[PDB]
């Protein structure tokens, strides 16, 4: 067929709704997630109108090839959604109600600055291109926007799913394009990061500081170098569950900062020993005693500064 | 076509059955599993009735496009199942018997609290949306629910596969939706975790405690720090075969707890040495002797407490 | 169409054959393998019979939608095979000869008890469901069962591919089902496991035993703990190329057993040192001398016992 | 149908445009990236011309099977693009305007010489094969070449997307082929490599040099060998995020160079000790003092030389 | 339709050609590679002949469903190729020229004996099954065999792509099958293996030998055991980029051999110490001095022997 023609000179309003059935596979590195959802569309096609009293039925079904249907697409998807059309109902006045269930893999960038205490706003951008015959524009039927109460996005809490109601209308390749921004707001379940990464990483650091209550260089080197190695493991573990950002992450900072602490601890340990060998154990012992306070205090100050800067 | 019309204002009952042919790929991290199964549907379409004596045959075949078939979907799947229709039989009174074989990848959340001694209840949710003309409702033909005796779910024992017989009927976007809960109950084969992870992890810990029968700081540091490193490896190995939970897992607890034991062992070892150097080997030696009992005893108490809390 | 009706009261025999063109991707963890093969089917459809003199050709081609073809399926596949039909020939008497080339990923469980000296029997189960009108039964044309001379399963030797000729006929959901068992018998190329895993693992163990010719506790601890760590690496490497079994594997046993040897070596080393410090180097030295023989002898006995128990 | 015939004897010009909607998945190892884009085509088909005054409309839609459309393909793709046709408009003079949205995975080699400070030029090669009846040739409508302002290629900055306007026309299998080069110019966000890899790698190296202020062989060996091990980890980490090049990468050089520094540090440490044992601590001490300056100075010179050679 | 019938009693010659557009993804472990290529076919169908002077055109196009086309298949592919048909031209005498572009994933075994200095011969086997009506045979049009000059197979140099011109004709399931062997000859770019694996592995080994200029058992144990651990890492790294072969690889040998050197170095170090403790430092010192020459000399001899045996 081809598009409904205008009563006057008005653009065709296509009403939209997304209802999320499943969110899954939030891939931090790819910056993607998968969705399974109802997509609902509604518009006026005069051509399809009818009399309820004459026709005997108050609604009419159609198969999708029978009528004109707007080419709605997702902007930020990897490949075109799989969609199974569920239902098409036309009411007497020629109002069409379309309903598909779809699944798609969606590109949407993530801000890792506060990882792993971060929150994100995922987007699904619906779009339509205007044809020559007629301009098409999108709108949001809020009654058809939602998510079910089970949706679980393993590793994240889901706050809200709402749509920015006013589309962005713009020219692309000499046609009008109308674009809606659906927004899925989430925040990361940070709990497990504490016992699995953060505390272990501290424990190894604090073990490194036992060298400040020790006069054995051979022990000290072993303490500080072994723990430094373990820290690297955690650095590596962490930098692998995350992509290459052009900014420091919060955890990144702490991790990096900690290298400085290991480095300086090695210097102290080196200096202590060097002085003992020159028979200045008195001076050595002042530095060691200072280190016992300076290290943990500066560590604490530094973290407060960092948390201040990142939150 | 379109749905069979009601004698009077009664909903259409669609009878369901799932018969599992294969379960496989229980992915702990994605919280998914794959299934290969018969799906059976049955319903009354009066329009399709016939006389056996007149028509000459007592059952009639059809191809799926020929008749009306309800749009049954799975709720908790990644993408719509692949289904090949096997057989459609209509009996004289217009009773339709549908049978497909399908495969699907199913989202179903797992409770890791008692891992790896955990059991799970997987769900497959069948659903149908009511049309305008007619309300549809699902029911369970218990004679068509089962699994074959071979279904092996590598890494798990299968207890039962049963369906909750009373559907959950609810409004979604101003239509009735009817949802059945099929339940596959499993429990994890925990055996291999003992030799591969648990005992090794203990053995390294117990080796760390040999420092309590030693006066060599250089040895002790090496004992405790090396074993601590090995423990980290196991922590890492374990946290990678599992997803990020917002709750402690049982194994998680033990693993985390064990870091405290390493930490305190380092303190003891540090203290012992420090006293020897101040010529108080007598006090050192009391602490070392106490540690020999305190460590294993507190370890045992702590584990009893944990197992109590988790089981 | 629908199935050929019987001359008398006999079930329809569908003759089968599988000819393997490629085996590949034996995935130990998933317990799957991939196959690329001819599937050959043959049956009598009288309805399709014809005169060579009238029709002008001596055999007739068809496209699969044109005629009735039995719904033959694989039982133990992940998803339905990709099949490209190669040829359908119907001979004058209505004898159909079907030939597809297919590929599928096949579930078939593996017994890891003697890994990596294990052999396996893979299965491909062909099946057909009987319709209402007619009972269908499968049989094996032995002349159409085989494999290519160059079919290779990287990491395995292929012994035989044969079919159990007598189907298993049984009721499922009130219809007859007929099931054939094709069997691919293989055995693992164990060679590479010797230089890459087994010997290294021994070498590190034997290095640990050099502590029996040493009086340096600091050295000994380092010897035994470092090698123990290397052993863990191999344990981890091995447990990752394999799934979680509810039984001990042979290699698993050895690996696990070896932890006990490391543990006891640490005890010996600890004891030796403790006695030296109490000025009983004489007793220490007896234990050390005994250990030099006891360890390797008990190791040998233990392995003989294990190999006996597993083979 | 088949191609438009020429007014005279001129080749058929097909005008092209690519508008990038999404770039993603730049896989360094595979040397690929994924794209989602509009492809626009335009050409003259006289046969389709019409009178605006007679026909009543000034533009005509068609479905793709209705008219002749050139077989445009991508050269450097893994498999043929998924394309959904968006719009086909024909203007009175028989000028066709084609528009598809496509997605494809594109092979395009990367030069790793300056990694991770590298820039790249990705290519998308459009191509068309001439038929017997007519020569077909491609051209670039610059007004239909662009990318939207959001395109984000996680880990990279995007400079430009432009097309080389003059096609390369050449014989392949005795027909003319016409090929356009679209060019996406990018440069790597190198920031994260500094804190995650580069600085750590230096810090461990500088720690190794503390052995130059130490007289303990047992400590020194531990310092230098442990840090060497950590360096290997980083070598391994790095060589895994990259493919096997037949040329040195910049980072590769530094990494490799650093092994020489560890090697020589071990020699120094070995020599120092050997002399102390022969009661020549005076000579030892000159070498150690020299090493304190020589190592960092030569390290600096060497890096300047390398950066000069690579930039 | 069905096949062209013979003028006399001759088999139908189908002329073939493969022109490689892209080679990629040479996966060493799977022993596969991916290809993107033109497949060209040519044969005589008398039925399609025509008069150029009468018909007015010297060539005729067809769509593939219109005419008979031989079922050419690849033998050694995972799944049937994706193919888009490009062009079908028929010349007056009924000579058909077919051209598709395809992509496929190809199984072809690799000989790892000389890795990573190995060369390989990849195969693509084209095949055709004869029908009842007619025998089909394949041949190679050498003018349609080639690859473009860009084909880059990341990690490999490409020597040649040629076809063995004489097919192998043989019986399979009582029909003739005709099989062509296309051969892609490649050799591995070994350069990067030197700096990334081989030299590091030597450097660690040579560091182990510094224990021959040292009298400290505690140092020596640390030197030799730490380096042994690093060697294991490289063994593991290497055995993971490769499959399980039933033969020694060259690199495998060296790696394995090197374990023996570490083992014996531990024995030497153990012996040296044991003698020092029994106050025989004189004998110890002879063995240590011998080791300084024996180790590197035997290492060199052994490698010469191995390279001789493998090349
Ligand atoms: C007592 C003076 C100590 C001064 C502190 C040194 C900090 C080094 C700054 C690095 C900046 C990047 C190039 C790094 C070499 C390692 C430093 C070893 C210190 C030796 C101590 C000798 C005791 C007298
Ligand atoms: C190493 C040092 C430890 C790391 C410190 C935690 C960082 C933090 O404080 O994280 C902050 C988060 C969430 O913050 P928000 O909701 O985004 O705040 C918005 C603030 N505005 C509106 C002002 C911008 O709260 C937490 O879950 C705290 C739990 C911390 C447990 C730490 C374990 C030890
Ligand atoms: C008698 C000593 C009691 C030791 C208690 C140690 C505090 C533990 C903090 C828990 C943090 C979670 C910040 C930690 C510093 C390292 C510990 C140094 C121990 C020195 C012993 C000296 C012997 C006289
Ligand atoms: C540190 C050491 C960790 C020990 C782990 C104990 C786990 C446990 O005790 O868990 C018990 C689970 C069975 O649990 P269930 O059948 O679900 O009972 C639930 C019913 N309630 C609610 C009434 C209790 O299985 C086992 O017996 C595993 C065998 C233990 C082997 C340990 C070897 C060392
Ligand atoms: C001479 C006494 C032999 C002692 C054997 C102890 C074995 C423990 C068995 C655990 C089973 C798995 C819980 C174990 C603590 C570490 C043991 C330290 C040995 C100290 C020797 C002192 C010599 C006088
Ligand atoms: C760690 C200790 C070393 C492990 C020793 C291998 C176990 C084994 O000896 O296993 C035996 C298998 C063969 O068994 P089968 O073919 O199943 O015969 C079953 C017949 N019965 C049931 C009558 C016994 O290996 C081999 O062909 C020999 C390989 C030896 C390599 C070892 C090098 C070191
Ligand atoms: C005082 C003499 C210094 C000589 C340095 C020798 C470096 C060897 C270069 C290999 C190049 C790749 C094959 C390498 C042998 C191990 C090195 C042993 C060093 C012993 C020092 C003893 C001090 C008297
Ligand atoms: C280990 C030693 C440290 C590594 C040094 C960085 C290499 C570099 O200096 O690289 C330079 C590239 C930019 O190159 P370009 O300007 O794009 O090329 C054109 C150059 N011509 C005109 C000369 C041909 O990146 C940078 O801005 C590097 C800034 C980060 C510093 C890293 C801190 C440590
Ligand atoms: C001078 C004595 C020569 C030693 C030769 C070593 C034979 C090892 C054979 C292993 C075969 C695989 C079973 C391995 C035990 C470790 C060997 C420890 C050597 C101790 C030296 C004592 C000095 C007098
Ligand atoms: C650790 C020990 C060093 C590794 C030895 C290198 C391999 C080799 O020596 O092998 C040689 C192969 C080439 O083989 P070919 O010429 O095709 O043989 C066919 C000849 N016939 C007919 C005699 C059989 O590699 C090379 O191009 C050499 C580059 C080596 C650099 C290594 C640096 C260290
Ligand atoms: Cl879409
Ligand atoms: Cl579904
Ligand atoms: Cl409700
Ligand atoms: Cl309703
Ligand atoms: Cl199947
Ligand atoms: Cl394409
Ligand atoms: Cl194929
Ligand atoms: Na339509
Ligand atoms: Na239907
Ligand atoms: Na040490
Ligand atoms: Na059929
Ligand atoms: Na067309
Ligand atoms: Na055809």
UniProtKB/Swiss-Prot annotation, chains A, B, C, D, E:
What membrane topology was assigned to this protein in its record? Answer: Multi-pass membrane protein
Question: What are the annotated GO cellular component locations?
Answer: plasma membrane
Q: Which UniProt keywords apply?
A: Cell inner membrane, Cell membrane, Ion channel, Ion transport, Ligand-gated ion channel, Membrane, Potassium, Potassium channel, Potassium transport, Receptor, Signal, Sodium, Sodium channel, Sodium transport, Transmembrane, Transmembrane helix, Transport
Sequence ranges on the Cytoplasmic membrane side: 213-215, 278-280
Regulation of activity: what does the record state? Tetraethylammonium (TEA) and tetrabutylammonium (TBA) inhibit the proton-activated currents in a dose- and voltage-dependent manner in vitro, whereas the blocker of acid sensing ion channels, amiloride, has no effect. Channel current of GLIC can be inhibited by inhaled and intravenous general anesthetics at and below concentrations used clinically. Ion conduction is also inhibited by lidocaine and by divalent transition metal ions such as cadmium ions.
**Where is the chain membrane-spanning?**
190-212, 216-240, 249-277, 281-311
Kindly list the places in or outside the cell where this protein is found, as annotated in its UniProt entry: Cell inner membrane
Q: Name one Pfam family in it.
A: Neur_chan_LBD
Family annotation (Gene3D superfamilies): Neurotransmitter-gated ion-channel ligand-binding domain, Neurotransmitter-gated ion-channel transmembrane domain
Q: Which residues lie on this side of the membrane: Periplasmic?
A: 1-189, 241-248
Sum up the protein's function in the record's words. Cationic channel with similar permeabilities for Na(+) and K(+), that is activated by an increase of the proton concentration on the extracellular side. Displays no permeability for chloride ions. Shows slow kinetics of activation, no desensitization and a single channel conductance of 8 pS. Might contribute to adaptation to external pH change.
Record comment regarding domains: Consists of an N-terminal ligand-binding domain that encloses a wide aqueous vestibule and a transmembrane domain that forms a narrow channel.
Instruction: Indicate the family of this protein.
Output: Belongs to the ligand-gated ion channel (TC 1.A.9) family.
Q: What else is known?
A: The homologous nature of GLIC to eukaryotic nicotinic acetylcholine receptors and other eukaryotic pentameric ligand-gated ion channels, and its sensitivity to general anesthetics, define GLIC as a structural and functional model of signal transduction in the nervous system, also relevant for exploring the molecular basis of anesthetic action.
Protein name, entry field: Proton-gated ion channel
Taxonomic lineage of the native organism: Bacteria, Bacillati, Cyanobacteriota, Cyanophyceae, Gloeobacterales
């Amino acid at each position: 067929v081809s598009p409904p023609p205008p009563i006057a000179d008005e653009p065709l309003t296509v009403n939209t709704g997304i209802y999320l059935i499943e969110c899954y596979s939030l891939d931090d590195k790819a910056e993607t997630f998968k969705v399974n959802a109802f997509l609902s569309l509604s518009w006026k096609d005069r051509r399809l109108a009818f009399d309820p009293v004459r026709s005997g039925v108050r609604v009419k079904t159609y198969e999708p090839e029978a009528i004109w249907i707007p080419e709605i697409r997702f902007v930020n998807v990897e490949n075109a959604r799989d969609a199974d059309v569920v239902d098409i109902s036309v009411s007497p006045d020629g109002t069409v109600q379309y309903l598909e269930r779809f699944s798609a893999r969606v590109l949407s960038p993530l801000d890792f600055r506060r990882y792993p205490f971060d929150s994100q706003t995922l987007h699904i951008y619906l779009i339509v291109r205007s044809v020559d015959t007629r301009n098409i524009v999108l709108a949001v039927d809020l009654e058809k926007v939602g998510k079910n109460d089970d949706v679980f996005l393993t590793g994240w809490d889901i706050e809200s799913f709402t749509a920015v109601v006013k589309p962005a209308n713009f020219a692309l390749e000499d046609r009008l394009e109308s674009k809606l921004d659906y927004q899925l707001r989430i925040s990361r379940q940070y709990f497990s990061y504490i016992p699995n990464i953060i505390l272990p990483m501290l424990f190894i650091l604090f073990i490194s500081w036992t060298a400040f209550w020790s006069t054995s260089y051979e022990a000290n080197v072993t303490l500080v170098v072994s723990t430094l190695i373990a820290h690297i493991a955690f650095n590596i573990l962490v930098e692998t569950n995350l992509p290459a950002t052009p900014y420091m992450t919060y955890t990144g900072a702490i991790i990096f900062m900690i290298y400085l602490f290991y480095f300086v601890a090695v210097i102290e340990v080196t200096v202590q020993h060097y002085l003992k060998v020159e028979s200045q154990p008195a001076r050595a012992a002042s530095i060691t005693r200072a280190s016992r306070i300076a290290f943990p205090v500066v560590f604490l100050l530094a973290n407060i500064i960092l948390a201040f800067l990142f939150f």
